[PDB]
Each structure stands twice: as C-alpha cells, then as structure tokens.
mmCIF file of N, CA and C and ligand atoms in Angstrom:
data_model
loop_
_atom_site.group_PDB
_atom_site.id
_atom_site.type_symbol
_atom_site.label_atom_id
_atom_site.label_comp_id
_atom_site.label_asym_id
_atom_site.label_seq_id
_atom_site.Cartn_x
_atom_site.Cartn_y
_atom_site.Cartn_z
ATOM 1 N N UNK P 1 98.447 100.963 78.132
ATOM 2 C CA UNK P 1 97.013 101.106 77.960
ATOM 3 C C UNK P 1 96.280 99.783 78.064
ATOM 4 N N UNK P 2 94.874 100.064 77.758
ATOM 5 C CA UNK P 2 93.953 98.813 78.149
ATOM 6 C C UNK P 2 92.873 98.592 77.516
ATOM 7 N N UNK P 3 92.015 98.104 77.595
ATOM 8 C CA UNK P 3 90.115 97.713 77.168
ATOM 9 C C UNK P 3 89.525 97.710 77.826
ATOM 10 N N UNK P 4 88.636 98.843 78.553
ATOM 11 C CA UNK P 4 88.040 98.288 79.734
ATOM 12 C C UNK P 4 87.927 99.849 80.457
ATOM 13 N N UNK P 5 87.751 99.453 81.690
ATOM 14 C CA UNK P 5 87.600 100.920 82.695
ATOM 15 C C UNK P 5 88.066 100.244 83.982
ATOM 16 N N UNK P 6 88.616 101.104 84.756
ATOM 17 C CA UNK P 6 89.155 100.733 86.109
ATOM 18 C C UNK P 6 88.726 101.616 87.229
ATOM 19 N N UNK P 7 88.847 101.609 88.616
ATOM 20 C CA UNK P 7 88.285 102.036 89.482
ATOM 21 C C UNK P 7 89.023 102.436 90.417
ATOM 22 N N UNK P 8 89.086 101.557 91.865
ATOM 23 C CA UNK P 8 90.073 102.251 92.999
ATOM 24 C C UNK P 8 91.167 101.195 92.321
ATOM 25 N N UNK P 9 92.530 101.881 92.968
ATOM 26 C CA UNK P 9 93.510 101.066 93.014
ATOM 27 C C UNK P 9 94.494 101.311 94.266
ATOM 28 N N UNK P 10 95.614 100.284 94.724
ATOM 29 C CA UNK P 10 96.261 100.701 95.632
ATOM 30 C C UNK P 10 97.570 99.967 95.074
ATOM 31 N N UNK P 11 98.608 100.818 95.564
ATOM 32 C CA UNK P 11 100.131 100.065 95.112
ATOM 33 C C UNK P 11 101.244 100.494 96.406
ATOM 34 N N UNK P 12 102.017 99.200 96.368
ATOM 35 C CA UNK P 12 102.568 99.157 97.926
ATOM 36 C C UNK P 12 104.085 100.452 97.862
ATOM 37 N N UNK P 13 104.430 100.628 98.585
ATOM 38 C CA UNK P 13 105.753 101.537 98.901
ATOM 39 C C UNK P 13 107.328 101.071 98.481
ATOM 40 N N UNK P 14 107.669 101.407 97.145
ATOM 41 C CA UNK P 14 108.936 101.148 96.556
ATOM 42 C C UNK P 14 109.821 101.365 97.474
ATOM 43 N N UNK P 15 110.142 100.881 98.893
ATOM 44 C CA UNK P 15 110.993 100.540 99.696
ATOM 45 C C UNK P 15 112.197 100.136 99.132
ATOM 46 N N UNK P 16 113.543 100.814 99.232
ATOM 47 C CA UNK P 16 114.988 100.807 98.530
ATOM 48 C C UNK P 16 116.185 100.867 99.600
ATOM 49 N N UNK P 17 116.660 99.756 99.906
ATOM 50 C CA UNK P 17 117.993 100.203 100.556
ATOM 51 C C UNK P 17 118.616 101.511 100.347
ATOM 52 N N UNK P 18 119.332 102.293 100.848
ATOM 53 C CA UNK P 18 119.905 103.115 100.495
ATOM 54 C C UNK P 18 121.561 103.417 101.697
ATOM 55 N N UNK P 19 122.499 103.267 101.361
ATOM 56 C CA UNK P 19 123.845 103.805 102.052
ATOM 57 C C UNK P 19 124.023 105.316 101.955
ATOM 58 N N UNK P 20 123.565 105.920 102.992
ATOM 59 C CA UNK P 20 124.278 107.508 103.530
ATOM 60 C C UNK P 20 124.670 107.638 104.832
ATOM 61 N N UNK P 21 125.098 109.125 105.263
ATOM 62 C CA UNK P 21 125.247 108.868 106.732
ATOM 63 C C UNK P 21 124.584 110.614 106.882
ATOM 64 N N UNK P 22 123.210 110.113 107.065
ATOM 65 C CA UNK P 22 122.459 110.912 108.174
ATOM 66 C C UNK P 22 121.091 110.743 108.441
ATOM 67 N N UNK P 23 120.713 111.196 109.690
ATOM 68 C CA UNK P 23 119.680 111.228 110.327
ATOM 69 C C UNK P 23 118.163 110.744 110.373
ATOM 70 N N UNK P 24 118.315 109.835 110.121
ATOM 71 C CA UNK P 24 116.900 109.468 109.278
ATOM 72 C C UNK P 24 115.989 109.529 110.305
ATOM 73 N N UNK P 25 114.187 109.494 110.087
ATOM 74 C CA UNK P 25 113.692 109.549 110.894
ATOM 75 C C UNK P 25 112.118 108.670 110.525
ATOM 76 N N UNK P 26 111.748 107.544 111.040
ATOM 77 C CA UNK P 26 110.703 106.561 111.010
ATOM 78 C C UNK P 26 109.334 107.668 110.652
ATOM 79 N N UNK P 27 108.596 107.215 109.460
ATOM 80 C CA UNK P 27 107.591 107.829 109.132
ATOM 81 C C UNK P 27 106.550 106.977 110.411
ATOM 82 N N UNK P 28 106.506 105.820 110.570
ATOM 83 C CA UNK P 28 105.968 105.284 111.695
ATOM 84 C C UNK P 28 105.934 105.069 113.002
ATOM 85 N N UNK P 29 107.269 104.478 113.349
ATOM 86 C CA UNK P 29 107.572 104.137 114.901
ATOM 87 C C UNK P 29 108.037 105.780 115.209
ATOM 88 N N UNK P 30 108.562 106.196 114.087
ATOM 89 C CA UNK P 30 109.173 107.866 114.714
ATOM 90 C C UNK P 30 110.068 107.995 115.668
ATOM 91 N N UNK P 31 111.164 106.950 114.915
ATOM 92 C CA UNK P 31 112.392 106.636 115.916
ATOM 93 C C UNK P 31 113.476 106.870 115.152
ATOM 94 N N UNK P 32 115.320 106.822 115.378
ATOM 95 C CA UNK P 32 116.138 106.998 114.939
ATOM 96 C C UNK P 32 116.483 105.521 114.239
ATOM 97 N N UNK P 33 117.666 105.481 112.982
ATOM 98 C CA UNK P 33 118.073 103.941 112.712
ATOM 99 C C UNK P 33 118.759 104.533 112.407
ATOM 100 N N UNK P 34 119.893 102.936 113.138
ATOM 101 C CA UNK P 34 121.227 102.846 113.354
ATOM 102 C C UNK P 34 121.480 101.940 112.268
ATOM 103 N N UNK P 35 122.439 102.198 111.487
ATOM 104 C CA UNK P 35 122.587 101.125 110.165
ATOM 105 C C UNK P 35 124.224 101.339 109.939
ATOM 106 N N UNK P 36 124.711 100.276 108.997
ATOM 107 C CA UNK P 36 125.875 100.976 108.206
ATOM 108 C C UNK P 36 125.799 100.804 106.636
ATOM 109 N N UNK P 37 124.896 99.880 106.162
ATOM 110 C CA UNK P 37 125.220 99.576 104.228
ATOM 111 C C UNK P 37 123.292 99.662 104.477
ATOM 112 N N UNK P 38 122.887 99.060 105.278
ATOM 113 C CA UNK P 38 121.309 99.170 105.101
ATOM 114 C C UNK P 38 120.486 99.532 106.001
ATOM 115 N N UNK P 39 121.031 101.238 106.074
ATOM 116 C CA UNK P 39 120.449 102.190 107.103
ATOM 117 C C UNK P 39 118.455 102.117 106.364
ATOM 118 N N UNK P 40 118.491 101.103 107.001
ATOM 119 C CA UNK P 40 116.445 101.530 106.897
ATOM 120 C C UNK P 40 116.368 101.394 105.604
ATOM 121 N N UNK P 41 115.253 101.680 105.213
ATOM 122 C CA UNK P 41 114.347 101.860 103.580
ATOM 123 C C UNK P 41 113.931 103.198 103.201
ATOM 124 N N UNK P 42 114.236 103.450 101.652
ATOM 125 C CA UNK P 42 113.486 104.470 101.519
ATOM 126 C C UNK P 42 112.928 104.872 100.389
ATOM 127 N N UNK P 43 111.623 104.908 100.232
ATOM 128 C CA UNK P 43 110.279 104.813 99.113
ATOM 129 C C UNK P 43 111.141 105.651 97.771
ATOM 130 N N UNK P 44 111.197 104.796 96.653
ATOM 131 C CA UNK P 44 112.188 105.597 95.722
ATOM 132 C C UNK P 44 110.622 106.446 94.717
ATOM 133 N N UNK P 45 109.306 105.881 94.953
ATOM 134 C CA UNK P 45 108.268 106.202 94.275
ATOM 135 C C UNK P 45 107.871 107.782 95.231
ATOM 136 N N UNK P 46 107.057 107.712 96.553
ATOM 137 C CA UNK P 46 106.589 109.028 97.310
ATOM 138 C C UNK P 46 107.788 109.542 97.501
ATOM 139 N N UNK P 47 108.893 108.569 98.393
ATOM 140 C CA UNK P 47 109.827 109.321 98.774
ATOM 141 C C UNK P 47 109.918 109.823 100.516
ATOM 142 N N UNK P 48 109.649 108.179 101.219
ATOM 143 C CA UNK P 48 109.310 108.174 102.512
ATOM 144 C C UNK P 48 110.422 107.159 103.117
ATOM 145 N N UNK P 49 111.002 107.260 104.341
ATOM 146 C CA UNK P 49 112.316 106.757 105.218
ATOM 147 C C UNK P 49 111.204 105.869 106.152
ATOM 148 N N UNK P 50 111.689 104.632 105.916
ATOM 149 C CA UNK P 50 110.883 103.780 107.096
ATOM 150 C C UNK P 50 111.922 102.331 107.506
ATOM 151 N N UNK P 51 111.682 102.054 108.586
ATOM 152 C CA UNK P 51 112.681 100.583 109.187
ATOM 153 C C UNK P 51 111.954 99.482 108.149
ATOM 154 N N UNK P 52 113.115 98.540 107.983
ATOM 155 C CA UNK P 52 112.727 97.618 107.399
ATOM 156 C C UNK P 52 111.126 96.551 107.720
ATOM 157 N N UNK P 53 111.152 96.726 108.552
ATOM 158 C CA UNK P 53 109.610 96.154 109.579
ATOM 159 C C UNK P 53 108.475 97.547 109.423
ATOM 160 N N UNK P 54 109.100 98.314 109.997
ATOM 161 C CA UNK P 54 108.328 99.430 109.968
ATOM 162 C C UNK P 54 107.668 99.902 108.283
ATOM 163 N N UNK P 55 108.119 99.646 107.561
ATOM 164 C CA UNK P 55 107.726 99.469 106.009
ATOM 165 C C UNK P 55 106.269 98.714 105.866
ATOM 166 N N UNK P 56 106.570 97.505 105.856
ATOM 167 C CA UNK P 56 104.634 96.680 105.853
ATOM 168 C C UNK P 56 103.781 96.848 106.738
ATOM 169 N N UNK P 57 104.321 98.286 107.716
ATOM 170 C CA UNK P 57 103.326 98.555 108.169
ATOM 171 C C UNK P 57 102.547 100.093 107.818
ATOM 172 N N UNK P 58 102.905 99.990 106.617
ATOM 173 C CA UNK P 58 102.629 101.915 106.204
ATOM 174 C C UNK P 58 101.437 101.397 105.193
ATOM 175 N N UNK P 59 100.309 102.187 105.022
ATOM 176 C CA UNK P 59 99.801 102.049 103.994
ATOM 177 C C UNK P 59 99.994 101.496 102.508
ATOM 178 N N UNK P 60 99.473 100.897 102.089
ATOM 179 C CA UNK P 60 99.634 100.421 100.391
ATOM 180 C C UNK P 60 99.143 101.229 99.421
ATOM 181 N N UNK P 61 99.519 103.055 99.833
ATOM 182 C CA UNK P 61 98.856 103.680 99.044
ATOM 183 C C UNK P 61 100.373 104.903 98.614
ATOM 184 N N UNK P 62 100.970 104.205 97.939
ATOM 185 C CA UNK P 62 102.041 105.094 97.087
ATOM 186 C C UNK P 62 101.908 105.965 95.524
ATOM 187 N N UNK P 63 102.122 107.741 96.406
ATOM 188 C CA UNK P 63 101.187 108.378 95.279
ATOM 189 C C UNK P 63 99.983 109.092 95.486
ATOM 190 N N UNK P 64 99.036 107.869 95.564
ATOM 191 C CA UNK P 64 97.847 108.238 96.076
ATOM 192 C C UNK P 64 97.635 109.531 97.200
ATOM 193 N N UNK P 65 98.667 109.433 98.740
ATOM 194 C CA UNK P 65 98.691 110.228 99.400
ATOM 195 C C UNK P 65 99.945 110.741 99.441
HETATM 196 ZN ZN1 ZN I 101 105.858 105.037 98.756
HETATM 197 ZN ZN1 ZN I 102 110.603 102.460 112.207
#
C-alpha cells in the first residue's frame, strides 16, 4: 500500500528462460525457435513466447492487455 493516488501505469514482460521441447511460436516476428537449454523467452506474468530480441520489442504493458 501507499499515501497518495496513482494513475496510468505500465510494467515490462517477465521474460523467463524456459527448457522444453516444443513448438513455440514468436508473438512478434511469428517465426519458429530453434534452441536447446534457452529455447526463446517466456512471460511467466501474461504468459507470452517471444525470441530473446523479439522480447524488447513487445509492449511494456504486462496484464494490462
Ligand atoms: Zn508479459
Ligand atoms: Zn521472434
């Protein structure tokens, strides 16, 4: 909690290594990744699969949408 009042906010994409073996698919470029221990990223907060690059390029709005 707080003192005060707050307004808009934005918070970036809990991007998480993760080791499995299947199919993932780029919320952005909308391409396949080839990995073996750090197949891509994936948002442990919304819950979105994105390339490591392909990540800072997604919105800073986790939750929100
Ligand atoms: Zn997210
Ligand atoms: Zn990508």
């Amino acid at each position: 909690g707080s003192s005060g009042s707050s307004g808009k906010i934005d918070m970036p994409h809990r991007f998480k290594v993760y080791n499995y073996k299947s199919p993932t698919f780029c919320e952005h470029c909308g391409t396949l990744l080839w990995g073996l221990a750090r197949q891509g990223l994936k948002c442990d907060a919304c819950g979105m699969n994105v390339h490591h690059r392909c990540q800072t390029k997604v919105a800073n709005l986790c939750g929100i949408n």
